[PDB]
Amino acid sequence: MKYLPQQDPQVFAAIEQERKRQHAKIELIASENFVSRAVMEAQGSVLTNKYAEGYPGRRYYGGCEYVDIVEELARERAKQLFGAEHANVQPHSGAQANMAVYFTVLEHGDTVLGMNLSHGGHLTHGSPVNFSGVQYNFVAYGVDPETHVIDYDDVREKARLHRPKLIVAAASAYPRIIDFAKFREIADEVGAYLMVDMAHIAGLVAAGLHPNPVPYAHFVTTTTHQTLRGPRGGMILCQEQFAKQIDKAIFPGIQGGPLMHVIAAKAVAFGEALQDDFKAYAKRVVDNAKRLASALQNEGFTLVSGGTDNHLLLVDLRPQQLTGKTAEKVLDEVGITVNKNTIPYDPESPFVTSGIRIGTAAVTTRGFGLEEMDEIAAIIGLVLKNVGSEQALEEARQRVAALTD
Amino acid sequence: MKYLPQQDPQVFAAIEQERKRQHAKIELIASENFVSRAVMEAQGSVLTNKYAEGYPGRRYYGGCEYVDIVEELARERAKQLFGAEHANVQPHSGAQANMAVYFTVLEHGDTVLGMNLSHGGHLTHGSPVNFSGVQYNFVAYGVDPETHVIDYDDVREKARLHRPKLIVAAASAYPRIIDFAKFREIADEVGAYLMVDMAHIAGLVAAGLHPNPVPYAHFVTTTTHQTLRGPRGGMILCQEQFAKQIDKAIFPGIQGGPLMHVIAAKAVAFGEALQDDFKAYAKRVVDNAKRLASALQNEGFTLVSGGTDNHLLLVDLRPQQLTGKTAEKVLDEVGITVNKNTIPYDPESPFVTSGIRIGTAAVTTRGFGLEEMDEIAAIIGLVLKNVGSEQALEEARQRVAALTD
Ligand SMILES: Cc1ncc(COP(=O)(O)O)c(CNCC(=O)O)c1O
Ligand SMILES: Cc1ncc(COP(=O)(O)O)c(CNCC(=O)O)c1O
Numbered sequence: 001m002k003y004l005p006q007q008d009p010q011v012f013a014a015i016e017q018e019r020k021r022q023h024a025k026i027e028l029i030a031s032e033n034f035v036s037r038a039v040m041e042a043q044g045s046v047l048t049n050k051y052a053e054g055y056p057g058r059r060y061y062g063g064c065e066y067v068d069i070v071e072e073l074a075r076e077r078a079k080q081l082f083g084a085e086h087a088n089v090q091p092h093s094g095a096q097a098n099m100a101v102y103f104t105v106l107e108h109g110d111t112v113l114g115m116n117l118s119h120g121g122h123l124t125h126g127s128p129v130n131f132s133g134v135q136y137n138f139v140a141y142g143v144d145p146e147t148h149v150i151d152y153d154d155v156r157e158k159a160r161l162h163r164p165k166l167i168v169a170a171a172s173a174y175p176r177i178i179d180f181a182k183f184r185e186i187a188d189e190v191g192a193y194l195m196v197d198m199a200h201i202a203g204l205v206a207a208g209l210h211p212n213p214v215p216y217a218h219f220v221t222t223t224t225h226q227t228l229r230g231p232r233g234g235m236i237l238c239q240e241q242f243a244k245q246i247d248k249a250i251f252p253g254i255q256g257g258p259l260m261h262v263i264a265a266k267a268v269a270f271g272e273a274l275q276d277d278f279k280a281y282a283k284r285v286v287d288n289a290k291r292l293a294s295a296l297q298n299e300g301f302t303l304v305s306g307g308t309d310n311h312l313l314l315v316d317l318r319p320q321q322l323t324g325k326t327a328e329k330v331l332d333e334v335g336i337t338v339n340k341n342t343i344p345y346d347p348e349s350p351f352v353t354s355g356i357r358i359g360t361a362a363v364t365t366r367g368f369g370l371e372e373m374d375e376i377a378a379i380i381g382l383v384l385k386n387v388g389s390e391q392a393l394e395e396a397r398q399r400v401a402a403l404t405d
Numbered sequence: 406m407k408y409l410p411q412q413d414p415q416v417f418a419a420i421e422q423e424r425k426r427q428h429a430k431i432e433l434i435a436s437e438n439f440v441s442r443a444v445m446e447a448q449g450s451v452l453t454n455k456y457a458e459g460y461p462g463r464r465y466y467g468g469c470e471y472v473d474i475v476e477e478l479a480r481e482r483a484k485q486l487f488g489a490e491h492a493n494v495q496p497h498s499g500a501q502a503n504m505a506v507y508f509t510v511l512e513h514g515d516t517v518l519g520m521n522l523s524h525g526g527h528l529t530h531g532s533p534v535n536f537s538g539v540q541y542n543f544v545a546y547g548v549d550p551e552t553h554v555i556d557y558d559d560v561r562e563k564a565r566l567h568r569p570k571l572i573v574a575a576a577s578a579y580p581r582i583i584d585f586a587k588f589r590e591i592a593d594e595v596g597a598y599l600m601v602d603m604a605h606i607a608g609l610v611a612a613g614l615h616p617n618p619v620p621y622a623h624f625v626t627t628t629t630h631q632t633l634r635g636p637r638g639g640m641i642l643c644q645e646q647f648a649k650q651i652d653k654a655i656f657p658g659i660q661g662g663p664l665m666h667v668i669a670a671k672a673v674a675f676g677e678a679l680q681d682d683f684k685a686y687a688k689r690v691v692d693n694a695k696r697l698a699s700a701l702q703n704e705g706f707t708l709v710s711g712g713t714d715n716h717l718l719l720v721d722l723r724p725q726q727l728t729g730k731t732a733e734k735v736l737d738e739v740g741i742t743v744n745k746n747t748i749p750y751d752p753e754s755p756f757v758t759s760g761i762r763i764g765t766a767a768v769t770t771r772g773f774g775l776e777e778m779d780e781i782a783a784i785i786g787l788v789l790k791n792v793g794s795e796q797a798l799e800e801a802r803q804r805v806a807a808l809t810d
Contacts, residue, residue: 001450007443008673010478015669018471019451029466031456038412043666044449045406046424048630048637051436061434061744062737066423073415092497095661103536108513129657131508225453232453232664252534256500259637261448264420268413332467339466 024404026336026376030312030359031172031200033229034366036272039265043231047261053251067260074263077270081206084214084237089266090250090258091234094199094223098124099131100236100249101219105166105193106136113164113192115150116140118342118350120174122197139164143174143344148305150174152182159190169213170197173341173357175308180216195219201310203227203361206273207282210310218242227285227311227361229278230269233262281364285311288360291370295377300385304343304355312359316343320384324353330387331356335400336379372403429809431741431781435717435764436577436605438634439771441677444670448636452666458656472665479668482675486611489619489642494671495655495663496639499604499628503529504536505641505654506624510571510598511541518569518597520555521545523747523755525579527602544569548579548749553710555579557587564595574618575602578746578762580713585621600624606715608632608766611678612687615715623647632690632716632766634683635674638667686769690716693765696775700782705790709748709760717764721748725789729758735792736761740805741784777808 005012022034047067053060056068056075071089078087091097106112112132115121119142123130126138139162141155159167169183180196187194196213202222204210213220220237224230238246251258272278286309293307296315304314317327324340331338341357348354363372379399386392410417427439452472458465461473461480476494483492496502511517517537520526524547528535531543544567546560564572574588585601592599601618607627609615618625625642629635643651656663677683691714698712701720709719722732729745736743746762753759768777784804791797 001446003442004446004673007441008447008676011447011475011669011672011676014471014474014478015447015450015452018455018475021468021471022451022454025468027468029456032454034451034454036412037408040449040451040453041406041409042413042416042420042449043453044445044447045420046427046439046445047420048445048448048670049427049437049439050423051434061742062733063426063430063432063742066419066426069419070416070423073419092501093661093664095659096497096501099659103539108540123657124661127657129653131659134508135513232662232666248534252528252532254500254504254536256498256529257637259498261637264416265453267416268409271413271416328467337466337468 024335026400026403027362028336028338028358029362030339030357031226032362033226034362035229035231035269039231039268042265042268043261045261045264047264048259050260051257052260053257055247070260070264070267074267074270077267077274078235078237081270081273082212082214082220082237084220085240086238086243086246088236088246088250089263090255091236092255092259093232094221094234095124096255097221097234097236098197100246100254101195101221102132102136103253104242104245104249108135109137110166111137111139111162111164112166112168113139113141113155113158113162114168115171115174116142118346119143119344120171122172125168125197145345148344149176150178152179155183156186156189159186159192163190164192166193166195168195168197170199172200173312173314175305175310175312175314177210177309180211180213184216193218195221197221199223200226200312203229203273203282204286204310207279209282209286219246224266224269227282228269228273229361229365231262231265233259233266235266284369285361285364288364288368288370288373289313291373292358292360292377295374296380299377299381301381311361312357314341314343315356315358316354317356317384318354322384322387323348324355325351326387327356327384330383330393331380334379334383334393334396335404375399375403429740431805431808432767433741433743433763434767435744435762436631437767438631439767440634440636440674444636444673447670447673448666450666450669452669453664455665456662457665458662460652475665475669475672479672479675482672482679483640483642486675486678487617487619487625487642489625490645491643491648491651493641493651493655494668495660496641497660497664498637499626499639500529501660502626502639502641503602505651505659506600506626507537507541508658509647509650509654513540514542515571516542516544516567516569517571517573518544518546518560518563518567519573520576520579521547523751524548524749525576527577530573530602550750553749554581555583557584560588561591561594564591564597568595569597571598571600573600573602575604577605578717578719580710580715580717580719582615582714585616585618589621598623600626602626604628605631605717608634608678608687609691609715612684614687614691624651629671629674632687633674633678634766634770636667636670638664638671640671689774690766690769693769693773693775693778694718696778697763697765697782700779701785704782704786706786716766717762719746719748720761720763721759722761722789723759727789727792728753729760730756731792732761732789735788735798736785739784739788739798739801740809780804780808
């Protein structure tokens, strides 16, 4: 940086701490990642500077000839990546992407069927303190109490009983592959649309390591920032038939001027995902998650669903008599960042929980491999099995520091 | 830039064209501006990298110690700038700032009273193709047919008749000072909340050149990117009493994770606005707008309301027998960027219009003064009065190029 340090020492000092923190810690929050310098450079550009309500070639302001190229690069790279008939790269976030789809297909009060929020469903999938749950009537399907795998008979019984106008599939904390074909078969049975929110697994879908929802769903939403490793923002993919309605849901519907600088960063991240080394990266993410899962079970931990098929894992801490809140706090003391997270059928509230959610996308981006996963799991075992020992905590700290340099 | 040019030549070529375009044209769109390099550097930072749902010291993820400092710098600088009891710097845009206030105070179907959309009201103030107009029952107040000044007797009669739960004041195309004291007096008469959307005039308010709505309104919303000259995004200001409800409206209400890099750029722009040279800049904006207005009337143009009290002006092109659409197209041919815009009581539709909206915030940022305003007005007179002359158009092009270098 050149002008920030001189103009605003306070903000520059805080940003520099954040940068150093990102390097010094072991980032295991399942939704995080580190973007490339090219992505950052696109979002730190003068494209911030342009008003561009509307779409490429159909704007409400003049002078959009060059931002139109950037937006079209994003939309066409997206379509090449996911094979969708249409993309909308304007959503300001994963939440706005979902909000726009809901605004397109639902009337206030309509019934929506989504994944139980304490079994893996996201906040934007029906939480009563979220617009989704306030504006519409959400009903949920759950996972089997023993396998922790989505119970497709339960999805079907709930659909047939509640007759939702829309079915939402996908999650923020589900460690197994989702069967989009079964979701579409149920939606068709009851005449409902199907929306797949692939925010956590988009990068895996792009690399062919997770079945692609595009051929089965009427709408696919996502964050551009988690496994896809793009800038923070959203995207909607959909069939050509809903293209105009989705575009209008975004603008003049729920947003105003798009963030063109961020849309340029989206295109840059989409370009990176189209390359072969991103496919090799994604494979390492999934390979790393399996390794980590296996290594954690070697330490004595129980994992929700018994392991993982993607980038994430959920540790059921009941066997160690720990709440997710306690485990997150003590891991934070040694430099390991995780989230507390409810487990299916959790006896504890969402603010306490009986589990921790972990993912490997961030550490894989920094170069960690199978040997690092073995060490991280050994570190977590030492800490969580010896919570009252300051000597264990200090050793863990030194082992974390050896990993991060 | 260093990594973008090598990683993505396509996106870098388009961004570089956009940068050159920004320098070569005369930017008169009233909502645009150019941010500083320090603001851009903050948004091109690694803060993109952090999940930070929740608020400073009350986050749903660990490791937010340093982004909490950045967010608090933004909120405290905002409060120093505007004198508000609370600020929320998370809105992803002006639209989300308004959406969150509406989510806080209104139930679906509630009545809202806002400025007539063809008299200066914004799209997010009741358009029937916008969420505001789809979710709530908007009714409008207008400007006097001759002075084009808000008719406060009409605001009051509409309030008393329709009994709105909320009254919205402010606009996207109103060239005169708004009397927030009268709006608050009417809201109190009918027991309605008062929301002021100051997006276009925030920078003028900050510099003391426009009366501050903060002391009169329950809620104040704004874009951080127009006269305030910050990154693209929104902000809500409000009394302490609604603080918790507004925070919850934003998260877990209508958004998810905030853009922390953008919040850092907000703080940087707020720091710049707190300095004396920003006050001198704002004064030049208003001085420039008056000069430009006077110079355009010297050319024979009629201006809506007869001039301007802020950064913007509206030309009624009826006397020249031109639609805003035609004038915008021919100004675009010579390098001058404006927007077509309906005028109060316009006989033409919103897609054609009888006017052009112009503002001076962008050209003032690049250093233009009173002499430049005189030349721009002489250029617009030459073009709009000689629309079929290619010689006039070519001369205009050479005069624009002499201004932009
Ligand atoms: C499945 C899923 N969908 C939407 C969001 C919201 O995205 P945002 O950009 O934050 O508005 C998320 C968020 N996930 C964050 C996390 O799991 O840590 C999501 O997972
Ligand atoms: C008064 C007013 N309020 C909200 C917006 C929406 O902001 P955004 O960041 O685009 O969602 C605007 C937009 N103005 C743009 C223009 O007038 O050119 C506004 O004016």
